[PDB]
Coordinates of all heavy atoms in Angstrom, one line a residue:
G269 N 82.8 38.9 164.1 CA 83.2 40.0 164.9 C 82.0 40.9 165.2 O 81.3 41.4 164.4
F270 N 81.7 41.0 166.5 CA 80.6 41.9 166.9 C 81.2 43.2 167.5 O 82.1 43.2 168.3 CB 79.8 41.3 168.0 CG 79.0 40.1 167.6 CD1 79.4 38.8 168.0 CD2 77.9 40.2 166.8 CE1 78.7 37.7 167.6 CE2 77.1 39.0 166.4 CZ 77.5 37.8 166.8
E271 N 80.6 44.3 167.0 CA 80.9 45.6 167.6 C 79.6 46.1 168.2 O 78.7 46.5 167.4 CB 81.6 46.5 166.7 CG 81.9 47.8 167.3 CD 82.6 48.7 166.2 OE1 83.8 48.6 166.1 OE2 81.9 49.6 165.7
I272 N 79.6 46.3 169.5 CA 78.4 46.5 170.3 C 78.3 47.7 171.2 O 79.3 47.9 171.9 CB 78.0 45.2 171.1 CG1 77.9 44.0 170.2 CG2 76.7 45.5 172.0 CD1 78.1 42.5 171.0
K273 N 77.3 48.6 171.0 CA 77.0 49.7 171.9 C 75.6 49.3 172.5 O 74.7 48.9 171.7 CB 77.0 51.0 171.2 CG 78.4 51.3 170.4 CD 78.3 52.7 169.7 CE 79.4 53.1 168.7 NZ 79.6 54.6 168.5
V274 N 75.5 49.3 173.8 CA 74.2 49.0 174.4 C 74.0 50.1 175.4 O 74.9 50.6 176.1 CB 74.2 47.6 175.1 CG1 75.5 47.4 176.1 CG2 72.9 47.4 175.9
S275 N 72.7 50.5 175.6 CA 72.5 51.7 176.4 C 72.4 51.4 177.9 O 71.3 51.7 178.5 CB 71.2 52.4 175.9 OG 70.1 51.5 176.1
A276 N 73.4 50.8 178.5 CA 73.3 50.6 179.9 C 74.7 50.6 180.4 O 75.6 50.4 179.7 CB 72.5 49.3 180.2
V277 N 74.8 50.8 181.7 CA 76.2 50.8 182.4 C 76.7 49.4 182.4 O 75.9 48.5 182.4 CB 76.2 51.4 183.9 CG1 76.1 52.8 183.9 CG2 75.2 50.7 184.8
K278 N 78.0 49.3 182.4 CA 78.7 48.0 182.3 C 78.1 47.0 183.3 O 77.7 45.8 183.0 CB 80.1 48.1 182.7 CG 80.9 47.1 182.0 CD 82.2 47.0 182.6 CE 83.0 45.8 182.1 NZ 84.3 45.8 182.7
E279 N 78.1 47.4 184.6 CA 77.7 46.4 185.6 C 76.3 45.8 185.4 O 76.2 44.6 185.7 CB 78.0 46.9 187.1 CG 77.1 48.0 187.6 CD 77.6 49.4 187.1 OE1 78.6 49.5 186.4 OE2 77.0 50.4 187.6
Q280 N 75.4 46.6 185.0 CA 74.1 46.1 184.5 C 74.3 45.2 183.3 O 73.8 44.1 183.2 CB 73.2 47.3 184.2 CG 72.6 48.0 185.5 CD 71.8 49.2 185.4 OE1 71.0 49.4 184.4 NE2 72.0 50.2 186.3
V281 N 75.1 45.7 182.3 CA 75.3 44.8 181.1 C 75.8 43.4 181.6 O 75.3 42.4 181.1 CB 76.2 45.4 180.1 CG1 76.4 44.4 179.0 CG2 75.5 46.8 179.6
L282 N 76.6 43.4 182.6 CA 77.3 42.2 183.0 C 76.3 41.2 183.5 O 76.6 40.0 183.5 CB 78.3 42.4 184.1 CG 79.6 43.1 183.7 CD1 80.5 43.1 184.9 CD2 80.3 42.4 182.5
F283 N 75.1 41.6 183.9 CA 74.1 40.8 184.5 C 72.8 40.7 183.7 O 71.9 40.1 184.2 CB 73.8 41.1 186.0 CG 75.1 40.9 186.8 CD1 75.8 42.0 187.2 CD2 75.5 39.7 187.2 CE1 76.9 41.9 188.0 CE2 76.7 39.6 188.0 CZ 77.4 40.7 188.3
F284 N 72.7 41.3 182.6 CA 71.6 41.1 181.6 C 71.2 39.7 181.4 O 72.1 38.8 181.2 CB 72.0 41.6 180.2 CG 71.8 43.0 179.9 CD1 71.3 43.9 180.9 CD2 72.1 43.5 178.7 CE1 71.1 45.2 180.6 CE2 71.9 44.9 178.4 CZ 71.4 45.7 179.4
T285 N 70.0 39.5 181.3 CA 69.4 38.2 180.9 C 68.6 38.5 179.7 O 68.3 39.8 179.4 CB 68.4 37.7 182.0 OG1 67.3 38.6 182.0 CG2 69.0 37.6 183.5
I286 N 68.1 37.5 179.0 CA 67.3 37.7 177.8 C 66.0 38.5 178.0 O 65.4 39.0 177.0 CB 67.0 36.3 177.0 CG1 66.3 35.3 178.0 CG2 68.4 35.7 176.6 CD1 65.6 34.1 177.2
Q287 N 65.5 38.6 179.3 CA 64.4 39.3 179.7 C 64.6 40.8 179.8 O 63.6 41.6 179.8 CB 63.8 38.8 181.0 CG 63.4 37.3 181.0 CD 62.1 36.9 180.2 OE1 62.1 36.0 179.4 NE2 61.0 37.6 180.6
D288 N 65.8 41.3 179.9 CA 66.1 42.7 180.1 C 65.8 43.5 178.8 O 65.6 42.9 177.8 CB 67.5 43.0 180.5 CG 67.7 42.6 181.9 OD1 67.3 43.4 182.8 OD2 68.3 41.5 182.2
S289 N 65.6 44.9 178.9 CA 65.5 45.7 177.7 C 66.7 46.7 177.6 O 67.0 47.3 178.6 CB 64.3 46.6 177.7 OG 63.2 46.0 178.4
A290 N 67.1 46.9 176.4 CA 67.9 48.1 176.2 C 67.9 48.4 174.7 O 67.4 47.7 173.9 CB 69.4 47.9 176.6
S291 N 68.6 49.5 174.4 CA 68.9 49.9 173.1 C 70.3 49.5 172.7 O 71.2 49.6 173.5 CB 68.8 51.5 172.9 OG 67.5 51.9 173.4
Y292 N 70.4 48.9 171.5 CA 71.6 48.4 171.0 C 72.0 49.1 169.6 O 71.1 49.4 168.8 CB 71.6 47.0 170.7 CG 71.7 46.1 171.9 CD1 70.6 45.7 172.6 CD2 72.9 45.6 172.4 CE1 70.7 44.8 173.7 CE2 73.0 44.8 173.5 CZ 71.9 44.4 174.1 OH 72.0 43.5 175.2
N293 N 73.3 49.2 169.4 CA 73.8 49.4 168.1 C 74.9 48.3 167.8 O 76.0 48.5 168.3 CB 74.4 50.7 167.8 CG 73.6 51.5 166.8 OD1 73.8 51.3 165.6 ND2 72.5 52.2 167.3
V294 N 74.6 47.3 167.0 CA 75.5 46.2 166.7 C 75.9 46.1 165.3 O 75.1 46.2 164.3 CB 74.8 44.9 167.2 CG1 75.7 43.7 166.8 CG2 74.6 44.9 168.7
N295 N 77.2 46.0 165.1 CA 77.7 45.8 163.7 C 78.2 44.4 163.8 O 79.0 44.0 164.7 CB 78.9 46.8 163.4 CG 79.5 46.5 162.1 OD1 80.6 46.0 162.0 ND2 78.8 46.9 161.0
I296 N 77.8 43.6 162.8 CA 78.2 42.2 162.7 C 79.1 42.0 161.5 O 78.7 42.5 160.3 CB 77.0 41.3 162.5 CG1 76.0 41.5 163.7 CG2 77.4 39.8 162.5 CD1 74.5 41.5 163.3

């Protein structure tokens, strides 16, 4: 189960590639 906060608007998140940057808070 991942619980994820990422510092970007959804539409951007939807098109993230491995090359993008953001801040995350992930609980695994």
Side-chain angles (χ1 to χ4, degrees):
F270 294 106
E271 176 181 282
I272 302 161
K273 307 178 189 207
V274 50
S275 63
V277 287
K278 209 193 171 177
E279 67 277 6
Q280 284 175 40
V281 173
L282 289 185
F283 301 104
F284 275 4
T285 65
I286 62 163
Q287 305 285 126
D288 286 285
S289 331
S291 303
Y292 285 90
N293 246 275
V294 176
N295 177 253
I296 303 143

